[PDB]
Amino acid sequence: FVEMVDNLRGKSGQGYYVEMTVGSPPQTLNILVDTGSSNFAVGAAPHPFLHRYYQRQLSSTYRDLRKGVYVPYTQGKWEGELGTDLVSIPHGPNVTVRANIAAITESDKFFINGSNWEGILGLAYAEIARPDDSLEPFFDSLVKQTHVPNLFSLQLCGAASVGGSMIIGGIDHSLYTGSLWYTPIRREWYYEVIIVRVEINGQDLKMDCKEYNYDKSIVDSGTTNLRLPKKVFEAAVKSIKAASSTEKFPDGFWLGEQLVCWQAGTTPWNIFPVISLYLMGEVTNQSFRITILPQQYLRPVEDVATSQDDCYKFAISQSSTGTVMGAVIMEGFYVVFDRARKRIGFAVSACHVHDEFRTAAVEGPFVTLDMEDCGYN
Numbered sequence: 089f090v091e092m093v094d095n096l097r098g099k100s101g102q103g104y105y106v107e108m109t110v111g112s113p114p115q116t117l118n119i120l121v122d123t124g125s126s127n128f129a130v131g132a133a134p135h136p137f138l139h140r141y142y143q144r145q146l147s148s149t150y151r152d153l154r155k156g157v158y159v160p161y162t163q164g165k166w167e168g169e170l171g172t173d174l175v176s177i178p179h180g181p182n183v184t185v186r187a188n189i190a191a192i193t194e195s196d197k198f199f200i201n202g203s204n205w206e207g208i209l210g211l212a213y214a215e216i217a218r219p220d221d222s223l224e225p226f227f228d229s230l231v232k233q234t235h236v237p238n239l240f241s242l243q244l245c246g247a248a249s250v251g252g253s254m255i256i257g258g259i260d261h262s263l264y265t266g267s268l269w270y271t272p273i274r275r276e277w278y279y280e281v282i283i284v285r286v287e288i289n290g291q292d293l294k295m296d297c298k299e300y301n302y303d304k305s306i307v308d309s310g311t312t313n314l315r316l317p318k319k320v321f322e323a324a325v326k327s328i329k330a331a332s333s334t335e336k337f338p339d340g341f342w343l344g345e346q347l348v349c350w351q352a353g354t355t356p357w358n359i360f361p362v363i364s365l366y367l368m369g370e371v372t373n374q375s376f377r378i379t380i381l382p383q384q385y386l387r388p389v390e391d392v393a394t395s396q397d398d399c400y401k402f403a404i405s406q407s408s409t410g411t412v413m414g415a416v417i418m419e420g421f422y423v424v425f426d427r428a429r430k431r432i433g434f435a436v437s438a439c440h441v442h443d444e445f446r447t448a449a450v451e452g453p454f455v456t457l458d459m460e461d462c463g464y465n
């Protein structure tokens with residue numbers, strides 16, 4: 089696993105990418121690690137944002153599937169040609185698999201201007217694969233062709249430049265401290281989990297637990313913020329406002345539209361509360377909690393090429409599509425995607441940033457009744 093440690097790189101807010109090789113002879117590409125999608129889709133045309141792109145025709149092991157794919161989302165679409173080719177990960181397991189590859193020939197608002205990645209590794213399940221669930225995802229192809237165990241674990245470490253580790257086929261003990269606790273994957277499509285309880289400095293948020301998972305709660309490496317449903321976001325902010333009422337901040341700060349600055353390098357971490365998220369456990373009526381520090385949700389401002397000091401951005405935002413546990417959560421925790429056993433493990437990361445008096449935690453067990461009722465149908 090030592091060869092797989094520190095195999096992730098990226099820029100702040102632009103995601104985490106891993107080095108991958110496709111085709112014969114091998115073409116080296118930087119590929120976004122994405123637990124929020126299920127397609128292995130790489131740029132295959134010279135879009136001006138891209139450093140590199142996949143050249144289908146120069147690979148002797150490339151096979152044209154003779155079928156297109158069209159993936160629209162919100163502000164954009166990505167599209168291209170479906171095919172298969174030989175894929176390997178230089179700083180991964182020593183194997184080569186024939187996997188599905190979507191050669192992106194056109195996209196709108198997909199690639200990020202200034203980033204160093206040229207494609208995405210959809211690490212989620214077949215059901216959200218496009219055009220349909222018969223297009224086998226990369227990790228499915230990996231496990232079915234090799235003896236690599238059906239799991240991977242992510243340690244995202246966040247610093248402009250960021251690093252991390254994607255351990256494929258196991259768990260590295262030295263990437264976490266304390267104990268690993270597991271939450272069941274509710275449904276195999278996104279990495280869907282169930283939040284049963286939320287606390288702010290120990291104070292229960294007092295919401296119907298169905299609100300925390302409306303209409304969904306996912307673990308996504310392709311998202312930066314901790315995104316919460318409107319009604320949950322409202323209460324959490326109102327609670328964070330209350331905990332830190334010794335200082336008032338502009339209304340735009342809570343919306344992520346304005347920055348807040350203190351004389352470097354202190355900085356009142358103490359007035360900001362810890363946020364505990366209770367997740368459904370492996371056992372009936374059993375749950376566990378993950379505690380995030382003010383240091384996870386107050387991020388040093390991305391691009392301050394004019395504005396020095398300390399300065400911060402509020403990294404909790406509202407969502408209309410359910411809870412998203414992004415880098416805000418994931419950078420605080422070593423996250424194990426145990427696909428073979430339908431579960432996701434959380435343990436305090438060895439690379440999380442802690443303050444002088446408080447510590448991030450994964451603790452349990454807790455008694456929580458009707459946890460299944462917190463999931464939305």
Ligand SMILES: CC[C@@H](CC(=O)NCC1CCCCC1)n1c(N)nc2cc(Cl)ccc21
Binds near residue numbers: 120161166198199
């Ligand atoms: C479901 C969550 C969203 C979050 C998002 O919008 N992320 C930024 C997105 C990541 C994938 C490359 C393009 C930018 N999301 C993720 N994780 N992967 C996605 C891929 C597509 Cl085609 C659309 C939305 C995606």
